[PDB]
Write a protein that binds this ligand. Structure first.
Ligand SMILES: Nc1ncnc2c1ncn2[C@@H]1O[C@H](COP(=O)(O)OP(=O)(O)OP(=O)(O)O)[C@@H](O)[C@H]1O
Ligand SMILES: Nc1ncnc2c1ncn2[C@@H]1O[C@H](COP(=O)(O)OP(=O)(O)OP(=O)(O)O)[C@@H](O)[C@H]1O
Ligand SMILES: Nc1ncnc2c1ncn2[C@@H]1O[C@H](COP(=O)(O)OP(=O)(O)O)[C@@H](O)[C@H]1O
Ligand SMILES: Nc1ncnc2c1ncn2[C@@H]1O[C@H](COP(=O)(O)OP(=O)(O)O)[C@@H](O)[C@H]1O
Lengths: 1585, 100, 200
């Protein structure tokens, strides 16, 4: 209760400012979770019988805690309600007229709430305001009043919505803004889109007081016959109802006038095109098609009535001839240039006249004379009667036996569907279902025309049709009110695909639809045909009236609830041939039937012959788009030929040109020859010609010349790349939002950068791009956040960029802006961009502000494979595929050579030396004789990671750059006699071979390096190294220009005796110095790299000592766990780096001036891939490496990295938890395969340590070499057998030899005058305890014993016939003062006695000491004696691992600490426990035994924490801020208690790490990760024998 | 139900690992000294291992058990019954060894 | 389970429809309902022989029969406003054929070939030649025998004719070959072997 009582005297309310300059409370989490924890703690302690410490304080504190809980639980709701209603009552205008009683009530409530807020602001202590009387009662009263007023607001909003039924289509906040912003009518003008069918804006007076008429999105405009004025109808609902009524009336009158006028055209023949065009322009497209329909239906009906007697002069032939002449006039008219609206009206007229022509021509010419015949009755017939006064009754549409009316609702202009026979039967079935009061349920494969056919039927009848898309676009909270609106306005509903809904949503919506349908069918009861009481169903707990005009349609791809209420039609196979024929005919194409007959099977073949990719779309939508593009191309060629009728252009060439111009960019490299072969098949002897675009090509050539890139034209080098750039330009022109997709290693970024430069130079418009990586940044930070309390809007990165572009500051339209999204696409963030990519071009923030991007902006994506993208995002934007064949290898070589010849490495002598080097290496790169052959050979070999051409070439280029730098330094050291040309040639050739060796197949095993060397030997004539029995990889190119072995440069070191096998001591060896030189090579070019290899192969130490080896490097050790996120790197920058804005832009640099920061990343591949296959931190590092910076979230500003570089190390991807790195990131970082050190390398690096420790005793100094040879050979023998396949824990690494040397040194540390048999016996004992106890079978153990004896005999034969000293080979420290060897019996007796006292004083269950228990006790004792002795107890559960560990820990005095684990055990609790044990181990000197079980590991993060704690000795990412300061203070105190001078944190932390090295042994008990298998001594604690 | 009817005189309380109040129910039952029946042993809760292991510390006339941080007096006759409803399950050896 | 057989299905359909709905209007409406019931039975017991018959197991059910009966009612009332015995030629045969081929029963059909089979049934049954006394509902039934057409003016004659149907329903009743039963029996035997096999 002490900690609970002290923490409640320090909490603060954490007041924050509000937009109304008020105070609010933040931190509900800290203010509720800790309170609940205190409640749990006090309840537990008062529950536990150990309550005789505090009795009344607990109860008083508990009632206080309940007071806090109640107060703040009411307070959070009151605050949320007040902020929401304050926004509603202040932002919205006209509230004084909109229910002023609630306005005054809210004013009083807000006054009381603000008085309470002032009271809290004066006293910001938590308990200070609790002690104030009346706070709870006033707060509860405020809650009740807020609930009542919110209920009143909801009831008023529902009443207003019921007043005007179309308000049911918009949400609560939109309706609030509509009813509040009455004066600002422009706010309603954006909401007009949702409520109505076609009108998007209403036309007002000059003073905005009279509604003159309506309009649409396209531009079509309708003048009201009698305009309505808002003056005498001030209420929004009243004058919107008047607008709707006047819109119905105006459409009725205009249709009557149009019908009367078209009777004149339809009287006979000889129609004048001029007056026909004037008639078309006069009336709306809806009314134009209606007039044509009415005229044709009436004319055919009169012709049939006259034909009723018989062959009465055939007026029906005259009707057909009139249709023919009208259609010919229309076909002639579309050839001439027309306005887009007139063009759309004319195409609608053509398609409808084609349907009318076909009906009479085919179905009616087969001897039909009766007007009541079904063959005429089946067709949709239009009967217009302007006599009737009612607006909605004048026009009647009758299909078969059904009799609908025409809801005179303006639809703007909507694309019509050609009446295919499938569409005809769809109309028939759906009308039959509607007549029988049954909804229609068409089904079939997606994209066949179900939703479009239903919508077309609804628009033919004039009903407003709602389409509810299924995938991730359902809002069930709005579905009910949308249904109520459909019922009360007589609209239609068409679910796009009903089966995509999951079970709960489908069930709820199906129940609602069932209720709707039973209500609808009740209108047609045989005994209740006359509806006296209107039919009402039950939605939202209210009786909503059902209008007979209402309809519901669902499309399958069917629930048991709706089987008996819905009729189904199969639309599996649409008629593509007739659709193509009619659309081509309506586009002015002659012989359109042949073109359709050819194009439809072609699109069928492309779905069959070509490959299958997600971005491919050869459905009907794509076919229609190709057709309209072909029409545009034909009209363009007609216009071009005019300026130099003309019905002789080849149509097939136009069609294939449109097909290729639209579809070739999406094709992969393999699919282009297939597409052209298919074109030669379907369209034989017809050629496709590319647009020349010579004006852009010249600028492209100039930009490529100045950008060091390769330009081509067609077949030569660069032709495919420049063609892809031109396709990118055409896609940019045609639409916005395009995405560039292709394998990493293609010229995507170069393509769009070069095209932007070419556009700037050619058109003169300045082009600046905004490259955004969306995966690195959080989506909530990408778009923006609304705080739950303040509800203040902080725009995100993309939102900030868009707002800056839109706001009138700089370059709104005089500059083209390209928002390039570099990274990987997935639903998570493209959900918002979906509304921007489509034709809406609108970005709806959750704040409610709508942002529409200007025309100049293009939203570009560059991705690699496009496999986690929704089809919605892919279809909403065009794309070009950048195949890997596009970026050829020779052009990469040309770019590298040009860049080397042009750009100085030290940004004239350097330029001259680079140009000489390039002249020397020209016959290798460009010629396809050495580097290409070596590249393909390396590709057909195996590497540790996937081989990416760009990575393998970039490492080579950087190494050649380092070669040039080496030559420059050689010249610098010798001014006289500089690098001569012959020496230069020799050096550059040999270094080029060496760099091919280390870059190509430089991340593979030694055997594959040897294979590459042998292949190079076969395919080059350069001077190879002389010795044929030594691999070329061992040799080095000296500055003199001759092959010198790397071994000759390996030095000898004499490490001090007290630093043997120390934490950080690297002894030089072949691999170490060679990797160090290569690492320096890639370090100079600031090029990030990753060292990959098996566990404990010397990756961390080699890189780490190399990094402190340079004087200008300041190293940062970061550990990448699975849960590693970019905020780790942000924190590292925040602590070791500073932000400066004094340059042209913000720049991030380390605080230490003149120091190059390096952020070493431990286990760079460890961070886990998200559910879309991307690693956030890896993408963030890729963004930093490639573009040299990132975006701050605080102010959304690009910051450039200065003096910052990354390096990593990792285990191979095949190991558990090792996710392969992305190829885009991989091409930037070269990798080196750090394999296990060879026999010779181990021999050297461990003979160093043997000599170092044996110098302690002069007598044994002669024995170091045989000892090292014995250790190395036994380790090799134990490595060839006992591999990972037999047992997963049979892993052998040079870290076990380190433990061997350290254990022998520890044994010999206090001992002196040791004979040779003593050294051999301690050697054999450590061999047993490191290589034999890990074994699982007795045969393996006896084999280990025999080979230990064998190697001990072979490496030194002068030892007594005793094996080591005897068979058992035992060691103990209890019997003596030193670690003296012991025998069996007295050791057994001592252990028995001490175990007896152990379980008589600490345990309650007796233990027996059998032989296995004694051996395991000895092993754990040996481990506890050795600092950083970590044990791996593998064996069956309940076999005594924990008990024996605690027994030996008590026997050695080690304090035992283990994790008290539960189900809700979390990461921060485990880190706090690790902090506690580290404090007790480093500070307050105390030996600790850390017993952790397999069940104690719940998350992989715990395992990573253990991995970083065991080998390294500390956890760098464990101590942050306050805790860091506290442990620094404690380490200072403990050091002065040990009388040591550290002072500097760097050194005091080093001492803490050393103390933890000495005072922490972790024992892991596991029932039967390779990284965890190392750095722990394995003890096979088998089952009881 | 056999276990309930057998231990009704001792007021046996029925609970499950899925219940959020399992720890509180465990503490109350262990303090008062009455039987507990924990069904849904599929999601075994590691906090019960000290109870199953019977790690008991007779120190200073205070028999106590290490449940998290606050150790609670282990009242006598505290029998906990673990139960499940399915017959196909592979229990971890940690739990399999500690129970009959 | 519904009892397999054309007679059982026709009896069930006749019992489902009220006699008032079948006996009003012109006296032919009873024969139109009889033809509709026979067509429904033929297309619904052919559904048992899924491979040889309806290529896919469609869902012709009670709702389709109700919709077809409603279509017959509406079109016969519209054609014959009075209550006299409408002439056989004046029956809207084309209207019923088209509405049953495209809507109602044709809504379920997916491929063109079962649609063609449905059209074959509709033109063979729903026609004016069905009025003649010697109209064959199914020809070559067991070779020599041929199912005739009951001459009735009211429900009772048709119901009695249904009850006097022979017990032996060979598959030639539905137009399928007489050995279609052999294939169905072989399939059921293989199914029983498979079901026994899975019980190990
Ligand atoms: N003529 C050339 N056109 C384009 N790139 C070239 C050309 N010659 C050489 N290159 C090199 O090829 C590479 C093209 O990759 P680019 O940077 O354009 O792609 P990215 O979008 O950044 O990444 P990735 O393609 O791996 O997804 C660059 O390293 C560039 O220097
Ligand atoms: N050249 C060398 N000089 C000295 N010690 C070496 C050398 N090569 C390997 N070792 C020893 O091998 C072990 C490798 O240490 P380290 O933990 O840094 O390896 P690693 O390969 O980075 O491991 P991991 O994969 O676990 O991160 C140490 O015990 C080290 O002393
Ligand atoms: N009969 C038709 N005439 C003209 N276009 C059609 C026809 N049927 C389908 N389409 C076209 O197919 C495209 C997609 O149809 P859609 O409504 O998505 O079908 P589904 O209901 O299977 O999703 C639309 O652009 C539409 O124009
Ligand atoms: N050698 C032994 N002789 C007698 N009892 C033993 C022995 N080893 C273990 N036990 C018993 O096992 C119980 C707990 O085993 P534990 O140490 O948890 O095994 P594990 O560590 O494998 O889970 C103790 O009560 C102890 O009495």
């Amino acid at each position: 209760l002490k900690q609970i009582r002290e923490v409640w005297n320090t909490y603060e309310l954490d007041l924050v400012n509000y937009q109304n300059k008020c105070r609010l409370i933040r931190g509900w989490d800290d203010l509720f979770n800790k309170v609940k924890e205190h409640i749990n703690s006090v309840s537990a302690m008062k529950l536990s019988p150990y309550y005789k410490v505090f009795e009344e304080d607990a109860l008083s504190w508990e009632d206080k805690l309940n007071r806090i809980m109640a107060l703040f639980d009411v307070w959070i709701d009151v605050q949320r309600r007040w902020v929401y209603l304050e926004g509603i009552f202040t932002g919205s205008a006209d509230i004084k007229h909109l229910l002023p009683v609630e306005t005054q009530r809210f004013q009083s409530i807000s006054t009381e709430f603000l008085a309470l807020m002032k009271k809290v602001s004066k006293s910001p202590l938590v308990m200070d305001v609790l002690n104030i009387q009346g706070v709870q009662r006033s707060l509860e009263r405020l809650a009740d009043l807020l609930g009542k007023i919110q209920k009143a607001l909801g009831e008023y909003l529902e009443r207003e919505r019921s007043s005007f039924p179309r308000f049911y289509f918009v949400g609560d906040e939109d309706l609030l803004e509509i009813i509040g912003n009455s004066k600002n009518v422009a706010k309603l003008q954006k909401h007009f889109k949702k409520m109505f069918a076609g009108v998007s804006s209403i036309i007002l007076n000059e003073d905005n007081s009279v509604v003159l008429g309506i309009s649409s999105r396209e531009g079509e405009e309708v003048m009201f016959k009698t305009p309505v004025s808002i003056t005498e109808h001030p209420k929004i609902n009243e004058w919107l109802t008047l607008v709707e009524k006047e819109m119905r009336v105006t459409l009725a009158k205009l249709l009557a006038e149009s019908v009367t006028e078209v009777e004149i055209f339809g009287k006979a023949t000889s129609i004048d095109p001029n007056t026909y065009i004037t008639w078309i322009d006069k009336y709306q497209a809806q009314l134009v098609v209606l007039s044509a329909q009415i005229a044709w239906s009436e004319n055919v009906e009169t012709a049939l009535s006259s034909m009723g007697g018989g062959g009465d002069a055939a007026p029906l032939h005259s009707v057909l001839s009139n249709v023919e002449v009208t259609l010919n006039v229309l076909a002639d008219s579309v050839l001439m240039e027309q306005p887009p609206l007139r063009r759309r009206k004319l195409e609608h007229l053509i398609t409808e006249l084609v349907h009318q022509r076909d009906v009479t021509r085919s179905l009616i010419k087969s001897k039909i004379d009766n007007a009541k015949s079904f063959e005429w009755l089946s067709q949709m017939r239009f009967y217009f009667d302007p006599k009737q006064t009612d607006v909605l009754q004048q026009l009647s549409i009758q299909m078969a036996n059904a009799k609908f009316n025409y809801g005179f609702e303006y639809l703007g202009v909507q694309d019509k569907l050609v009446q295919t026979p499938l569409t005809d039967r769809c109309y028939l079935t759906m009308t039959q279902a509607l007549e029988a009061r049954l909804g229609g349920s068409p089904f079939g494969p997606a994209g066949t025309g179900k939703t479009e056919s239903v919508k077309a039927l609804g628009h033919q009848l004039g009903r407003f049709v709602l389409v509810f898309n299924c995938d991730e676009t359902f809002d069930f909270q709005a579905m009910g009110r949308i249904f109520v609106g459909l019922c009360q306005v007589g609209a239609w509903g068409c679910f796009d695909e009903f089966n995509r809904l999951e079970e709960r949503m489908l069930s709820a919506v199906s129940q609602q639809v069932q209720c709707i349908q039973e209500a609808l069918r009740e209108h047609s009861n045989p005994n209740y045909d006359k509806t006296s009481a209107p039919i009402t169903c039950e939605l939202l707990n209210k009786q909503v009236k059902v209008s007979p005009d209402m309809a519901i349609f669902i499309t399958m791809n069917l629930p048991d609830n709706l089987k008996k209420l819905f009729r189904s039609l199969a639309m599996t196979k649409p008629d593509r041939q007739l659709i193509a024929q009619v659309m081509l005919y309506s586009q002015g194409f002659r012989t359109a039937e042949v073109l359709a007959n050819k194009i439809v099977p072609f699109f069928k073949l492309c779905d069959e012959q070509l490959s299958s990719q997600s971005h491919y779309d050869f459905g009907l939508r794509a076919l229609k788009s190709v057709l309209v593009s072909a029409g545009n191309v034909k009209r363009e060629r007609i216009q071009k030929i005019k300026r130099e009728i003309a019905e002789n252009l080849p149509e097939q060439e136009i069609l294939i040109q449109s097909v290729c111009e639209t579809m070739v960019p999406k094709l992969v490299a393999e699919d282009i020859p297939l597409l052209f072969s298919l074109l030669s098949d379907v369209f034989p002897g017809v050629q496709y010609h590319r647009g020349e675009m010579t004006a852009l090509r010249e600028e492209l050539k100039k930009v490529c010349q100045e950008m060091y890139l390769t330009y081509g034209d067609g077949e030569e080098v660069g032709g495919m790349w420049v063609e892809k750039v031109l396709q990118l330009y055409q896609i940019t022109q045609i639409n916005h939002g395009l995405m560039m997709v292709g394998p990493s290693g293609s010229g995507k970024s170069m393509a769009w950068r070069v095209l932007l430069k070419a556009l700037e130079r050619l058109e003169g418009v300045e082009g600046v791009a905004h490259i955004i990586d969306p995966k690195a940044i959080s989506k909530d930070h990408l778009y923006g956040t609304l705080d739950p309390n303040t509800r203040e809007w902080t725009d995100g990165l993309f939102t900030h960029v868009l707002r800056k572009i839109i706001d009138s500051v700089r370059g709104e339209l005089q500059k083209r802006q390209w928002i390039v999204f570099d990274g990987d696409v997935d639903p998570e963030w493209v959900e918002n961009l979906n509304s921007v990519l489509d034709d809406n071009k609108l970005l709806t923030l959750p704040n409610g502000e709508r942002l529409s991007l200007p025309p100049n902006v293009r939203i570009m994506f560059e991705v690699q494979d496009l496999k986690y993208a929704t089809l919605a995002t892919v279809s909403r934007c065009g794309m070009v595929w950048f195949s890997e064949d596009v970026l050829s290898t020779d052009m990469i070589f040309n770019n590298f050579l040009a860049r080397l010849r042009s750009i100085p490495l030290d940004d004239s002598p350097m330029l001259q030396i680079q140009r000489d080097a390039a002249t020397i290496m020209q016959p290798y790169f460009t010629s396809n004789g050495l580097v290409t052959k070596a590249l393909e050979h390396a590709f057909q070999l195996e590497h540790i990671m996937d081989l990416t051409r760009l990575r393998c070439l970039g490492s080579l280029f950087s190494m050649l750059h380092q070669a040039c730098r080496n030559v420059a330094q050689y010249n610098a050291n010798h001014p006289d006699f500089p690098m001569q040309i012959e020496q230069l040639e020799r050096y550059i050739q040999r270094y080029l071979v060496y760099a091919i060796l280390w870059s190509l197949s430089g991340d593979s095993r030694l055997k594959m390096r040897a294979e590459l060397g042998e292949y190079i030997r076969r395919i080059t004539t350069v001077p190879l190294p002389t010795a044929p029995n030594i691999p070329i990889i061992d040799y080095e190119v000296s500055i003199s220009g001759e092959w010198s072995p790397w071994q000759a440069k390996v030095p000898q070191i004499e490490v001090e005796t007290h630093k043997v096998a120390a934490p950080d001591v690297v002894v030089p060896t072949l691999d170490t110095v060679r990797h160090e030189a290569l690492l320096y090579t890639w370090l100079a070019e600031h090029k990030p790299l990753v060292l990959c290899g098996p566990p404990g192969s010397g990756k961390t130490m080699t890189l780490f000592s190399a990094l402190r080896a340079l004087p200008d490097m300041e190293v940062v050790g970061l550990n990448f766990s699975s849960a590693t996120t970019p905020e780790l790197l942000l924190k590292t920058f925040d602590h070791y780096c500073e932000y400066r804005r004094t340059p042209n832009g913000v720049v991030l640099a380390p605080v230490q001036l003149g120091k190059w920061l390096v952020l070493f990343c431990d286990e760079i591949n460890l961070p886990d891939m998200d559910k879309y296959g991307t690693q956030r931190v890896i993408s963030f590092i890729r963004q930093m490496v490639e573009h040299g910076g990132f975006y701050r979230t605080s102010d959304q500003t690009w910051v450039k990295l200065e003096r910052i570089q990354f390096v990593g190390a990792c285990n191979p991807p095949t190991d558990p938890g090792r996710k392969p790195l992305s190829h885009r990131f991989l091409r930037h970082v070269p990798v080196v395969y750090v394999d296990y050190p060879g026999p010779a390398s181990l021999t050297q690096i461990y003979g160093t340590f043997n000599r170092a420790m044996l110098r302690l005793i002069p007598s044994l100094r002669t024995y170091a070499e045989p000892l090292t040879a014995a250790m190395v050979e036994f380790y090799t023998m134990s490595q060839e057998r006992f591999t990972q396949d037999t047992q997963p824990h049979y892993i052998y690494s040079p870290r076990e030899m380190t433990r061997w040397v350290r254990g022998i040194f520890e044994a010999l540390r206090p001992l002196e005058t040791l004979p040779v048999e003593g050294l051999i016996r301690i050697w054999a004992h450590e061999a047993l305890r490191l290589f034999q106890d890990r074994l699982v079978e007795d045969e393996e153990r006896r084999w280990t014993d025999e080979n230990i004896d064998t190697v001990a005999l072979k490496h030194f034969p002068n030892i007594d016939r005793e094996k080591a000293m005897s068979r058992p080979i035992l060691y103990s420290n209890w019997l003596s003062k030193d670690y003296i060897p012991v025998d069996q019996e007295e050791l057994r007796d001592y252990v028995k006695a001490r175990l007896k006292v152990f379980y008589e004083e600490e345990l309650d269950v007796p233990l027996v000491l059998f032989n296995e228990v004694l051996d395991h006790v000895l092993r754990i004792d040996r481990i506890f004696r050795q600092p950083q002795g970590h044990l791996l107890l593998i064996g069956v559960s309940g076999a005594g691992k924990t008990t024996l560990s605690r027994f030996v820990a008590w026997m050695n005095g080690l304090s035992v600490y283990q994790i008290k684990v539960h189900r809700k055990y979390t990461g921060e609790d485990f880190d706090e426990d690790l902090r506690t044990v580290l404090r007790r181990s480093g500070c307050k000197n105390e030996k600790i035994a850390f017993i952790m079980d397999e069940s104690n590991v719940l998350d992989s993060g715990f395992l990573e924490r253990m991995n970083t704690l065991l080998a390294n000795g500390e956890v760098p990412g464990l101590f942050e801020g306050d805790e860091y300061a506290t442990l620094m203070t404690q380490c200072k105190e403990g050091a002065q208690k040990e009388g040591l001078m550290l002072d500097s944190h760097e050194e005091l932390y080093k001492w803490f790490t050393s103390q933890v090295i000495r005072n922490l042994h972790v024992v892991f008990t596991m029932n039967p990760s390779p990284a965890l298998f190392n750095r722990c001594v394995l003890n096979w604690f088998g089952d009881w024998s | 139900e056999f276990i309930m009817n057998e231990y009704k005189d001792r007021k046996i309380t029925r609970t499950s690992f899925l219940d959020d109040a399992f720890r509180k129910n465990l503490e109350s039952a262990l303090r008062f000294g009455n039987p507990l029946l924990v069904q849904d042993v599929e999601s075994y809760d590691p906090v019960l291992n000290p109870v199953l292991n019977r790690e008991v510390r007779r120190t200073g006339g205070r028999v106590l058990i290490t449940l998290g941080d606050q150790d609670i007096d282990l009242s006598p006759s505290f029998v906990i019954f673990l139960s499940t409803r399915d017959p196909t399950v592979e229990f971890p050896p940690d739990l399999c060894s500690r129970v009959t | 389970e519904p009892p397999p057989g054309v007679k059982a299905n026709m009896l069930r359909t006749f019992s489902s429809i009220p006699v008032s709905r079948i006996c009003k209007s012109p006296n032919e409406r009873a024969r139109l309902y009889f033809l509709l019931a026979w067509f429904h039975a033929i297309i619904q017991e052919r559904l048992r022989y899924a491979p040889l018959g309806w290529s896919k197991k469609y869902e012709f059910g009670e709702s389709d029969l109700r919709s077809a009966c409603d279509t017959v009612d509406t079109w016969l009332d519209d054609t014959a406003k009075g209550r006299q015995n409408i002439s056989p030629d004046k029956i809207p045969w084309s209207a019923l054929k088209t509405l049953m081929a495209q809507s109602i029963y044709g809504g379920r059909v997916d491929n063109e070939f079962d649609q063609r089979l449905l059209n074959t049934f509709l033109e063979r049954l729903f026609t004016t030649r069905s009025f003649d006394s010697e109209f064959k509902l199914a020809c070559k039934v067991d070779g020599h025998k041929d199912i005739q057409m009951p001459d009735g003016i009211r429900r009772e004659e048709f119901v009695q004719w249904v009850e006097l149907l022979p017990d032996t329903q060979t598959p030639s009743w539905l137009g399928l070959p007489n050995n279609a039963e052999r294939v169905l029996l072989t399939t059921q035997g293989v199914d029983m072997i498979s079901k026994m096999l899975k019980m190990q």
